[PDB]
Amino acid sequence: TAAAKFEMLSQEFFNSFITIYRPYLKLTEPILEKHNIYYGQWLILRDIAKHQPTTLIEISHRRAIEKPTARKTLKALIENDLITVENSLEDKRQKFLTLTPKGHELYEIVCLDVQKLQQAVVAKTNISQDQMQETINVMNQIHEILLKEA
Ligand SMILES: NC[C@H]1O[C@H](O[C@H]2[C@H](O)[C@@H](O[C@H]3O[C@H](CO)[C@@H](O)[C@H](N)[C@H]3O)[C@H](N)C[C@@H]2N)[C@H](O)[C@@H](O)[C@@H]1O
Ligand SMILES: O=C(O)c1ccccc1O
């Protein structure tokens, strides 16, 4: 349920990359399942790690989600002692978030596995380090038009 829980040339172009996303989650899912953590949770955990100290506000915006799912997910991450909250007396949404030592352990373990899984998939294809630096360039152009719009 880890991947499950997270529930014309141009047509063939957007399809090559927009249809790889779920197989992908289904493949990298066990990595997460092994740390008793879900995708949504994990995506949040990673966001806190790349930008801590951060706050729900900041996280919602960056991640591009709704405070309700962001907040409900943050609570579990907390509930599971993977991130901390600077104890003040402001509103939860404004407080600071940081990974707990536990969370760093987990995070770093997951990171290392994904990288390994990913390096493996490439080593099973004819793709070159050129094709990968060149894919990224096509890709980023698109990712830009999508964000510089939304
Ligand atoms: N808001 C929607 C989000 O959709 C994606 O979901 C991403 C998670 O990061 C991955 O999580 C872990 O598995 C991946 C497999 O390698 C790794 O790439 C990643 N570093 C690991 O953390 C997850 N499995 C799929 C995908 N990567 C983007 O990432 C994120 O930016 C974007 O905003
Ligand atoms: O329950 C919390 O401690 C909490 C903290 C930050 C953001 C949302 C929350 O529910």
Curated annotation (Swiss-Prot):
Keywords: DNA-binding, Transcription, Transcription regulation
GO biological process, one term: response to stress
InterPro entries on file: HTH_MarR-typ, MarR/SlyA-like, Tscrpt_reg_MarR-type_CS, WH-like_DNA-bd_sf, WH_DNA-bd_sf
SMART domains linked: HTH_MARR (SM00347)
A molecular-function term among this protein's GO annotations: DNA binding
Every HTH marR-type domain range: 8-144
PANTHER family: TRANSCRIPTIONAL REGULATOR, MARR FAMILY, TRANSCRIPTIONAL REGULATORY PROTEIN
Annotated protein name in UniProt: Uncharacterized HTH-type transcriptional regulator SAR2349
